[PDB]
Amino acid sequence: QEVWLRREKWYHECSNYHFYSSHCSTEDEFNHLRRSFVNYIKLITGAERPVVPAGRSAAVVLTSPDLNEVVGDLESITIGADAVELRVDLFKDTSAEFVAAQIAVIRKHADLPIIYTVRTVSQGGKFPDENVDELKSLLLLGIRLGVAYVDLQLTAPNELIEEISSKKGFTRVIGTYQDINGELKWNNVEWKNKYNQGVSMNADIVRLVGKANSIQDNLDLENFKKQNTLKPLIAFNLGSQGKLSQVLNGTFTPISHKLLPNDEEFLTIGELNQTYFDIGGFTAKKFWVIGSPIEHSRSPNLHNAGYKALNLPYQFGRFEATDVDVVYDNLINKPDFGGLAITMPLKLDIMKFATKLSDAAETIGAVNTLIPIEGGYFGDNTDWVGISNSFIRAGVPPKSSSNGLVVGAGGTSRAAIYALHQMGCAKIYLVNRTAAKLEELVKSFPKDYNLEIVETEQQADKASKVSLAVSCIPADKPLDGEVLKKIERILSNGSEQSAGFKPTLLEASYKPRVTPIMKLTEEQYKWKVIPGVEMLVNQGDRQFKLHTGFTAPYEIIHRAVVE
Amino acid sequence: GIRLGVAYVDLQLTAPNELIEEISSKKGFTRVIGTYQDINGELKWNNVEWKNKYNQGVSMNADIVRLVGKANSIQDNLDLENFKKQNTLKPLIAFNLGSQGKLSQVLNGTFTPISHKLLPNDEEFLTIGELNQTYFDIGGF
C-alpha cells in the first residue's frame, strides 16, 4: 500500500485509457473480467465497435447508490438486457475513485456495454447544473475506462459537446433530451431541432424521452420515428401512460428490476415481453429437438429455462425422428414453427431444407439449427461455436497463437477441426483410433485448414505448440495401443510453450463426466480439462440467440443441464 | 332483422347493388354497419382498396363502416392508427385479425369485438378481462 499510492497521480495521468483488475473469487468472476477485457480492448484499439444492436434490445437501468449492495443478484439483474445504463449522478459518491470502483464491480458480473449517464438536475437527475467542470471530467472517465456508450445532453454547454465529440475515441455518443414537464407534444418543432442537434454533433444514437398525458402521445411518437431515420432513435414517452412507447421501442428500451430503486416506473424484463406478446409482437411458437435416441437430450431443459427467465411465449419439446420427411409434415410446415435443434442421425439430412446455409454449414457438412427466414429456412452449425466458446470461457484467447489436436473421428469431429481453425491455431494435428476414416478429413477440408496427420511416435516430437486439444473418442475404450503413445508425447510439451494460457483439452462426450482421457491430461501432465457439459450449454447458447434473438441467461441455463 | 327491431344491421360492401339499395331503402331506423374483411391478408392500410371501401360506406349512407384487416406484423396495427386519423367522416371500426393484430383490437374505440370462454372462438378475440388488462399494460387505464 506504500508503493502504490504515491504513483497513482503519475499512473492515472500518463494513460489515455485505464483498466481495473481486481481479486476474483469464483471462475465465473475470473471469466467476466477476461471477457470484458476483450470487448474493452476491441474498443480502445478500434477494431470492432458494438454496432447499435439491430434486433430489439433493452438496457437495464442500474439505479443503485452502491452496487456492492446488489452484487450477488447482479447476474439476475442483467437478464435480457443488452446494455447497462449506469446513472452516475445517483451514486453515493461521484468521485473518480468511486465510479471506477462501481465500474469494477460490474465487469466482474456483467459482460455488457456500459451506458455512462451523468444525468443532471434539469433533466431529472441528482447531479447539479451549476458545476459544469465535474460533469466534463466525469464523462472523460467514461472515455478512459473504456465504456461503450457515453451520454452527452443536448441542452448542455457547447464546449462540453465539442469536447466529448472530438475526444470521444471509440466510445460512442448518445444524445438525450428529456421533457421533464410534459409541455411538448410529438409534433412540436423542438423535437425536430433536437434531432438535428444529434445529426450535426454526429452522435451515434439520439434519445428523445417525452412524457405521455394520453395514449395518443405514444402514436405521435411512432409518427415521429418514421419521419426521422438518419441516426438511430431511442424514443419513448414516460409516465404511466407511456408504456406503449417503451414496449414498441426497438433500440435500448430502459428496463429495471425488483431489486433496484425503480423510480421512473420502468418495466421489468418479464413485463416488457409479456406486454409485447399481448399486443402481438411475439407469437406462441414451438421449437423442437429431433433425433433418434432423444429420450435424454437435455436440450429442452436448457431452452425452457431461458424462455421462463425472459417470459417469452415459447415451448421446447422432443420429436423422435429417423427420416427428414416426417419433420417437414409434422413440425416445419405448421404456422407455429419456430425452429429446430437437430441431433446426431439427422444432421446430414436437414441440409436439404436450408435455402441459406452459413459458411460453417458447407465446410462442416452438418446443420444443427434450422430457423425460418423470408422465403425458406436458414441453416447454421453451432457446434463449432460450442467447441470454441468452451475454450474462451476457460481462459483461451479468441485469436491466440498455439496449435491444436483433434483426437478421434467421431460425430463432432469435423466441427472441432473447423472450430480450431477459426480459433487461431496455426496447425491442426489429427490423431485417431484407427486410420481408416483418417485421410477423408483432409480431402474434405481446405488446404488452408492444414490437418497434419500424426502417423508415428517420433512425429509426436515434431508436433509443436499443441495447447488446444479436443478429444472426441467415444469413452468406451480405455486408451491404449498406437493411439495412447501418440497423445502422451503430445501433451507432455504442454505448459512450457506459454502462449498466454494454460494448455486446454475439451472432452466432447457429455455422459461420461470423467473420461479416461480427461484423467490422463489432467492428473498426469497438468492441463486444464473441460467436461462436455460445457459444450452442450455453449452449443445451446448460440441456438438460443438464433431461435429467440435474445442472449440466454447463462446461470439459469447452466443450472438446467447440470442436474 | 329489420322487422324484429335489431339495432345494427350489417350489410357487406361487396354485396350486389340490388341488396345494398334494397336494405338501405327500408331500414327505417336500424343503423347499417358496412363491412369488408381482408380474409387473404395482403392489403396493407395504405392501398386505394381501403379508401374505396370506406367511400362505398359514405356513399350508401352507412352509419358505421367496418374495415377488417389481417396483420402479418406489428406495423399494420400502427398503419391502421394513421388510417383512422385520415378518415373521420363516418364512424369507423378497424382492426387486424390474427395473433399479430392484438394491439389494433386493444386500441379501438367503437365496438371492439370480444369473446368468452363458454362460447366457440375462432378469430382469437380477447375477453373483457384481457382487453382491459392489455389496455392497462399499455397505459390507457
Neighbour order of strands in the sheet with B92-97: B8-12, B31-37, B64-70, B92-97
At A113 the three-state DSSP class reads coil
Q: Do B138 and A243 touch (CB under 8 A)?
A: yes
Enumerate the residues of chain A whose CB falls inside 8 A of the CB of residue B82.
223
Nearest to B137 among A223, A278, A284 (CB): A278
- Measured CA to CA in angstroms, residue B109 lies from A153, A266, A307, B76, B132 at distances of 39, 27, 34, 17, 13
Give the 3-state secondary structure of A6-72. CCHHHHCCCCCCCCCCCCCCCHHHHHHHHHHHHHHHHHCCCCCCCCCCCCCCEEEEECCCCCCCCCC
Tell me the β-bridge partners of B68.
B37, B95
B81 touches chain A (CB under 8 A): yes
Q: Kindly identify which residue of chain A lies nearest to residue B96, measuring between CA atoms.
A: A280
Give the 3-state secondary structure of chain B. CCCCCCCEEEEECCCCHHHHHHHCCCCCCCEEEEEEECCCCCCCCCCCHHHHHHHHHHHCCCCEEEEEEECCCCHHHHHHHHHHHHCCCCCEEEEEECCCCHHHHHCCCCCCCCCCCCCCCCCCCCCHHHHHHHHHHCCCC
B66 assigned to active site? yes
C-beta separation of A215 from A241 below 8 A = yes
B41 touches chain A (CB under 8 A): no
Q: Do A275 and B134 touch (CB under 8 A)?
A: yes
- Measured CA to CA in angstroms, residue A410 lies from A384, A397, A413 at distances of 14, 26, 5
Enumerate the residues of chain A whose CB falls inside 8 A of the CB of residue B138.
215, 218, 243-244, 247, 275, 279
Taking the CB of residue A447, how many other CB atoms lie within 10 A of it? Answer: 7
B63 touches chain A (CB under 8 A): no
At A267 the three-state DSSP class reads strand
Closest of A305, A376, A285, A299 to residue A344, by C-alpha: A299
Nearest to B100 among A241, A242, A280 (CB): A280
B89 touches chain A (CB under 8 A): no
Angle between the N-to-C axes of helices A299-310 and A269-278, in degrees from 0 to 180, rounded to the nearest 10: 90
Nearest to A241 among B77, B133, B139 (CB): B139
Q: Do A244 and B138 touch (CB under 8 A)?
A: yes
Angstrom resolution of this structure:
4.2
Enumerate the residues of chain A whose CB falls inside 8 A of the CB of residue B99.
280, 283-284
* Sequence-separated (6 or more) residues with CB below 8 Å from residue B96: B68, B69, B70, B71, B76, B77, B80, B104, B105
Amino acid letter, B113? P
Which one is catalytic: B44, B53, B66, B102? B66
Dihedral of the alpha carbons of A132, A135, A136, A139, in degrees to the nearest 10:
-170
What is d(CA A431, CA A469) in angstroms, rounded to the nearest whole number?
Answer: 11
Taking the CB of residue A519, how many other CB atoms lie within 10 A of it? Answer: 13
Dihedral sign computed on CA atoms, order B69, B75, B77, B78: negative
What is d(CA A450, CA A430) in angstroms, rounded to the nearest whole number?
Answer: 10
Which string of DSSP letters, residue by residue, matches A98-109? HHHHHTTTTTTT
Amino acid letter, A309? A
What is d(CA A61, CA A79) in angstroms, rounded to the nearest whole number?
Answer: 12
B129 touches chain A (CB under 8 A): no
C-beta separation of A149 from A176 below 8 A = no
What is the DSSP-derived secondary structure letter of residue A399?
T
What is d(CA A362, CA A55) in angstroms, rounded to the nearest whole number?
Answer: 26
* Sequence-separated (6 or more) residues with CB below 8 Å from residue A113: A39, A50, A82, A83, A84, A147, A148, A149
Cell 453451432 maps to which residue?
Answer: A382
Enumerate the residues of chain B whose CB falls inside 8 A of the CB of residue A219.
78, 81
Q: Do B74 and A247 touch (CB under 8 A)?
A: no
Q: Do A248 and B98 touch (CB under 8 A)?
A: no
Q: Kindly identify which residue of chain A lies nearest to residue B97, measuring between CA atoms.
A: A280
* Sequence-separated (6 or more) residues with CB below 8 Å from residue A522: A505, A528, A529
A132-138 own/partner pairs: CB under 8 Å, 24+ apart: A132/A157, A132/A160, A134/A94, A135/A160, A136/A160, A136/A163, A136/A164, A137/A96, A138/A88, A138/A94, A138/A99
